[PDB]
Symmetry: C5
Subunit: 258 residues, 5 copies
């Protein structure tokens, strides 16, 4: 596509506003937003995580007003993690930090990630341990070899289904994704404190170095997210991932292309 | 509402200067600024916190000079009041080691403030949907398991002081177009408070179109939470500790149609 | 009414000085330290000794006699003696067997201000039943409301080694003729992070281009630099503070 | 070299996109991306690490389109660590952080480093311990003396081979490297949390203070990297370095020289 | 001097490139870059550190081309050399836990550098005025209890290498107008070193008037400290570990009156 002028006028702009719920595993009817308690395999060879123990990428495909050549161009993003103050519940079946103390709050490894694109997020598969057996009902790197622990170019995929692509074995493919803007931070360590900021005054500009945002193929906007905030420790010491929803507001304009 | 010109002239500006006290629970006549000591339920379904154990949002509705003109909030200076109180490490706390000073206030903090031309709009989200919030608090009603991530039924206005518990409400990012809000949750049992003070910092409240919050009915709404962390008693029991927040807001008269 | 700045060689002056810390100085050998910290047996019985309480430092500096008033325009400031915290061999508490001594660490408060009059203070107490000791100036008639905000507790930082750090802060409702800056970093294991350089200048002008205007040709400097606590071999702990350098540039301003 | 004007026209620019795999030691056929478990000598003098326990620098020499005097000038870099979310696998033969807890995640000492130049990265040898015996199959500071613990100007080398130059005994030589741009961070400490950021929106400009980027001698571009993320702790407590691959995208333009 | 114009043209600029080795104590023929193991006095009064246990400031005086014109230092690039040595966690250190790797170098650090047209000016400050500093070091003389906070008698020049202990001297902020200095003390026994390297970062040495350090007698003075932390031996004994610092300074000729 050769990119030409922006359309102007009342009709030329539109907005998407929505939220993506986290997909942490949801091990039972009371534990939406949590994973199953984490168990550790006896050996590398025997690593076989159950689906409800594996956080997955969230994705939404948002239909835009039909245009047809014009395409919707995503220009700005406001985004926020929803429910940050829930982590102040340190009185609910947790593990006391010391005798008579409050419960240990959610903490430890986090991944906060979001993207806005004009097509599905492109994924590259990378595994901690290539002998991990990923479970039925997930989509994972197939024919994994030892080289998959560092880089195996066979593992290419699209983030095209919710509750399906486990976080731990996929990343945005930096060799593609030219029509998407993605941003993420993995903060490791078992004791790391969550640090969650909220404001309605911050905008991210989605334009590239040529002044062009993601262009929405087939008039669909793709939003993706992961917000694994840390782990919740219950009184037994067992730990579960806890996630939160992410708010998106995207402003778009119509752009002519050839 | 179409927004038109700003008014000028000596008459056209005003300032609001005040403080909001923290609402940490205040379990007895001696414990203003603290919560009740925190206990832990044996199961999710038995989580039933006492009201005096729950920090709540602070809010103040400030009447402005009667005025279509509307007062437009343009700048904010804000500060946490009494930061140095956290240097009292001698008041029946828990020695960090034999012969040592008391463990200082630390752990989970939430520092939040907002300035708007109407009540802060809230979205309820719960850690655990089977938590029973107590009498005298206002809380997400008809909670379901979906309320643990997002249930759009839980909409409210921060319209009452010491009533909305911090842990089950956040600013609603889907609304709040006429408010500016800012907050940080810093988690962890051992996180050190880091509290900055200065009278030289100003936050501009104008949006991307140059328009600040417009005060409906000539009222300015200020909201805050400043849970600084937990105080650990000698016994090991822990209480939230909060501090007041100073606000100075400058406003100008704006014509609307 | 602030009018024009005077120019010419004669129109500027500089103040350069240091403020020593006032940590309690429990004996003739312990300048810069507090008395070891004890913990009350009950919350109600909190009663810290004077020599256990760090206090605000203040200096009033006379300026050249001058309507014109000296206007403070810039500040350079620095903590003096940051490397002393590398002494980990002076009867401290070994971090483990055969190890060096635990360094100074823990709760710190670093604060400085420059004004044309005394810093204005607001009293706030951690515990309203704390008995503050004879020889200190503290919030009088404290009530439970003093734990969060009691507007009765107003004061001027007008005396050195007197106003305890823990029960006073800069009053944000006043201080229009002062510029102040402070950070409390709390936690028993927090590391000191102390930067020094002679290349960084703070501008003291407000949003209208006006710096503090020095009433009576006096400049007021205040500081706190509680760096953390030193832990003795026995486990007892003392606050340790350090001196602060100030360099302030001033210019003559006409006022009506 | 006198540097003259930049060529223009559609023909005057090119891009290199690739990835460099980590070289952590690879102790067996299942442990690509890991080192051998780390052991400790019994005396300072007897330090003698095995080759498979020593992470090494990665390097790639990338042939560029033939010129000829024109040279390719490297102007911009996008780079990213690939597979950051692998660190979320805390269920694979690790050491529980407490009773019933999840596995301790990868953490501890990290070195993240990358460079782009018009010739091989120039190295200076520095050793923690001059009496360390570096193993056969590595290239290490020769004839080390006590002065080599701080600075011995004899130890000059070029990063010209993979799986050869151990990270711990070489650094970029700050006294040379004028035709290279390098960037690195050592974060030391056994419990340091990894903090890994990903985005496709960040570009580094490689131009120096005269507006000139690395000039590619012989039409070769040199990319180097190290991404030791931390250590993985096994059930028994033994620890292995864990590394990840690094993506590079470099934009180049033709520059006339005399 | 009145500072006049910069000279232009051929031979109006020059560069200095060098490195300064650390002076950590060097307790034997094998331990260049380390201190003697750190011992703790039995009483506060009896503090008496051995010379080889005390890191010292590094200094180099670099002769410039002979020139009134004076060489004016305009820019600096600097780097710590050998940052990756801290990845040696296999050399008779102390395992962090059963079967683990050795504890890496960590804890209290001081990273400092200056560039000036004359010797760095020092002010003495002591942690403990009853500390007996050892023969062969240059230290605050006639120390009194006031020396624990500020005693203006302790003035010195950093005019000798491996002589001025780091712990009892700092740059004198009341002087040093013809030097630019930068440092950071990071304290705590477990602080992680964070060491950045790049050849793309330049510091400009010009003051607010556009004037860099002017080199009296055509000599440039470079000073450094890079105590990276402590190495913990298998036995638990600890030694300071330091690294060399690279300097590249660009200078120009300046006429003065
Ligand atoms: C364990 C011990 O005796 N330490 C004392 C030390 O002895 C020297 C050797 O010990 C180490 C160490 O301190 O652990 C071994 C390390 O690998 C060395 N590390 C490096 C990087 O060199 C350090 C280091 O050289 C010094 O600490 C630097 O000052 O030394 C010890 O193994 C050796 O033992 C000899 C023994 O003397 C001899 O009779 C026997 O036949 O063979 C043994 C093995 O060769 O002796 C070394 C001294 O020659 O020496 C230092 C001197 O500074 C101290 O005396 C240290 O004692 C500890 O000091 C602590 C204070 O930091 C604390 O007070 C402890 O209570 C002391 O035990
Ligand atoms: C030790 C004890 O019995 N704690 C009770 C508490 O009894 C209080 C007094 O205890 C203390 C405390 O918790 O250690 C003493 C402390 O100095 C006080 N601190 C302040 C700043 O006031 C606190 C504080 O007032 C309360 O915790 C606020 O809720 O109280 C005790 O010494 C005295 O004999 O009796 C007093 C009567 O109340 O009462 C609390 C009422 O909420 C609790 O019942 C507390 O029980 C402990 O609670 C822990 C969880 O928070 C845990 O479950 C322990 O097992 C339980 O003993
Ligand atoms: C161990 C002891 O008896 N501590 C007393 C103290 O006695 C001091 C001397 O003790 C020390 C110390 O506290 O360890 C020794 C240390 O090297 C000194 N450090 C410095 C930098 O000078 C300190 C220091 O001078 C004081 O703590 C300052 O207040 O003192 C002791 O070795 C000597 O035999 O006698 C000395 C007194 O003449 O006196 C203190 C007076 O405040 C306390 O009474 C201290 O007792 C401890 O107090 C702690 C908090 O107050 C804590 O509660 C302990 O449980 C308690 O034993
Ligand atoms: K398997
Ligand atoms: K690409
Ligand atoms: K309940
Ligand atoms: K909205
Ligand atoms: K009392
Ligand atoms: K005021
Ligand atoms: K050896
Ligand atoms: K060079
Ligand atoms: K002595
Ligand atoms: K001076």
């Amino acid at each position: 596509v050769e990119v030409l002028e922006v359309k102007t006028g009342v009709d030329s702009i539109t907005e998407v506003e929505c939220f993506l719920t986290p997909e942490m595993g949801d091990p039972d009817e009371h534990l939406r937003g949590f994973s199953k308690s984490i168990s550790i395999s006896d050996t590398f060879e025997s690593d076989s995580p159950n689906k409800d123990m594996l956080p997955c990428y969230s994705v939404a495909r948002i239909p835009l007003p039909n245009l047809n050549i014009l395409m919707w161009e995503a220009v700005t993003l406001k985004t926020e993690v929803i429910g940050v103050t829930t982590l102040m519940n340190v009185h609910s079946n947790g593990q006391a930090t010391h005798d008579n103390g409050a419960a240990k709050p959610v903490q430890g490894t986090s991944f906060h990630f979001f993207s806005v694109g004009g097509e599905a997020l492109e994924l590259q598969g990378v595994v901690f341990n290539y002998r991990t057996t990923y479970p039925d009902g997930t989509i994972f790197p197939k024919n994994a070899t030892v080289q998959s622990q560092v880089m195996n170019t066979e593992h290419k995929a699209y983030l095209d289904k919710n509750k399906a692509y486990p976080v731990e074995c996929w990343v945005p493919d930096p060799t593609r994704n030219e029509n998407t803007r993605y941003f993420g931070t993995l903060t490791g360590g078992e004791n790391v404190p969550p640090v969650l900021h909220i404001t309605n005054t911050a905008t991210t500009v989605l334009l590239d170095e040529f002044g062009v945002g993601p262009l929405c193929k087939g008039d669909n906007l793709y939003l993706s997210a992961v917000d694994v905030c840390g782990m919740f420790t219950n009184r037994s010491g067992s730990q579960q991932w806890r996630g939160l929803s992410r708010y998106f507001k995207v402003q778009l304009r119509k752009r002519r292309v050839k």
